[PDB]
């Protein structure tokens, strides 16, 4: 996989500030017809600065970020099913190895399922040895 690198380009700082600015805009003006109206204007303010020097842009983000924080909503919207959401990761699933400690009679209620897991265990070791050099 790929682990993100902490260094963030100035181009990305503007990107993030734009995303936060719009999401904050939704909270204030919930309604889509109003939101789309105001969101369009918000995009305009960025295009009237797109043609500027970076060092000038450094001044823009500073006041651009502060005014956002100075205008943060008192109850910002989130998505209930994701990080920070009210309903995020409600359930916790133990690690797989729990199943292997069932009483042998308990396992008899799902003989097919435990039959398969032990075929997978044979495959898993060979998979693990190759990946990490055993």
């Amino acid at each position: 996989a790929q682990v993100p690198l902490a260094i963030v380009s100035h181009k990305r700082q503007v990107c993030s500030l734009y995303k936060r600015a719009l999401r904050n805009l939704e909270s204030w003006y919930d309604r889509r017809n109003v939101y789309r109206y105001r969101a369009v204007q918000l995009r305009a303010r960025f295009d009237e600065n797109r043609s500027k020097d970076l060092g000038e842009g450094i001044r823009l983000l500073a006041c651009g970020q502060r005014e956002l924080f100075e205008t943060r909503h008192f109850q910002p919207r989130n998505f209930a099913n994701s990080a920070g959401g009210c309903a995020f990761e409600r359930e916790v699933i133990p690690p797989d190895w729990v199943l292997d400690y069932w009483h042998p009679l308990e396992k008899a209620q799902y003989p097919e399922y435990f039959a398969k897991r032990e075929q997978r265990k044979k495959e898993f070791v060979t998979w693990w040895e190759k990946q990490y050099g055993k």
């Binding site: 682990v3 699933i93 797989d96 292997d100 396992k107 097919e112 399922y113």
Partner: protein
């Protein structure tokens, strides 16, 4: 020896992909295939089998008899209404019977073994005066308890000593 796991050698099979973030960042083709296989195994195409062994290993002899009688009416009625309908009648004919005998024992206790002056423990009842209203017997009714000995007698006025 006593094998807790019963032979089956405990391990972890799911690997990285259980955690959501570890999936989004990236997954090699083999991992994706493995992850797809894992989910396909979690599907069960039958309900749990009924193991006779548990039903005796988790029912003590006392319980197997203490319930024996009312399980005969479950056996008698289960072809008349279906196992679900009949068993509900077995559960409510039984659990309700305990309640009926529960009140009577409670009703009995508060009628003879209520706390008296010769013990400290036991439930002690001090009821109030019923609202006497016109039409009731002897409307100008008065509390018969006047002297201090009347109050909190706890059956002491009628003791022999």
């Amino acid at each position: 020896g006593a094998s807790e796991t019963g032979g089956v050698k405990p391990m972890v099979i799911a690997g990285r992909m259980v955690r959501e973030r570890e999936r989004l960042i990236g997954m090699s083709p083999e991992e994706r295939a493995w992850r797809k296989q894992w989910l396909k195994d979690q599907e069960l195409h039958h309900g749990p089998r009924k193991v006779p062994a548990l039903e005796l290993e988790l029912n003590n002899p006392i319980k197997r008899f203490y319930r024996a009688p009312l399980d005969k009416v479950c056996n008698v009625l289960e072809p008349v209404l279906g196992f679900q309908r009949a068993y509900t009648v077995r559960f409510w004919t039984g659990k309700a019977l305990l309640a009926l005998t529960g009140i009577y024992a409670g009703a009995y206790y508060f009628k003879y073994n209520q706390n008296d002056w010769t013990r400290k423990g036991g439930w002690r009842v001090i009821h109030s005066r019923k609202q006497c209203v016109p039409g009731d017997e002897g409307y100008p009714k008065v509390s018969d308890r006047s002297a201090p000995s009347d109050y909190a007698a706890r059956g002491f006025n009628e003791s022999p000593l």
